[PDB]
Design a binder for this molecule. Structure first.
Ligand SMILES: [Zn+2]
Length: 145
């Protein structure tokens, strides 16, 4: 069976086998590693294209000068690297991207939201340490669609 994933560099859709031999796949338009484990900073122009990915996608809605946002950031990044082939990690600076923040009706920061196949699966209210963050992800991903 096939699935679609989005090139985090050029936004191209790339069709891949659901069951992969490795994670070395490269974007067919631009050569970019499809699974580089890097956090992605989304804007009003990229977010919706990113949501077309069939990979699970966790989104951190944050702001500058926000203590829990600061402490969550490195945890978000490190987790991102550990799951390069399974989950994409996206960040939205609510102050850079006010229309996005309004559209997603963000009521606290940070807000951490998991999206799967266009569905909003669950959100965390605030920052958490890495282990409870890893547990939350695993639990939500093992959940039935
Ligand atoms: Zn590309």
């Amino acid at each position: 069976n096939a699935m679609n994933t989005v090139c985090t560099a050029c936004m191209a859709t790339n069709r891949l086998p659901e069951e992969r031999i490795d994670d070395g796949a490269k974007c067919g338009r631009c050569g970019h590693s499809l699974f580089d484990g890097e956090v992605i900073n989304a804007t009003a122009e990229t977010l919706d294209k990113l949501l077309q990915d069939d990979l699970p996608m966790v989104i951190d809605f944050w702001a500058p000068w926000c203590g829990p946002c600061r402490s969550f950031a490195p945890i978000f990044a490190e987790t991102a690297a550990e799951r390069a082939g399974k989950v994409r990690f996206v960040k939205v600076n609510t102050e850079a991207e006010p229309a996005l923040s309004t559209r997603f009706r963000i009521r606290s920061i940070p807000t951490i939201m998991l999206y799967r196949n266009g569905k909003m699966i669950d959100m965390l209210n605030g920052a958490v340490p890495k282990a409870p963050f890893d547990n939350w992800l695993d639990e939500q991903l093992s959940r039935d669609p």
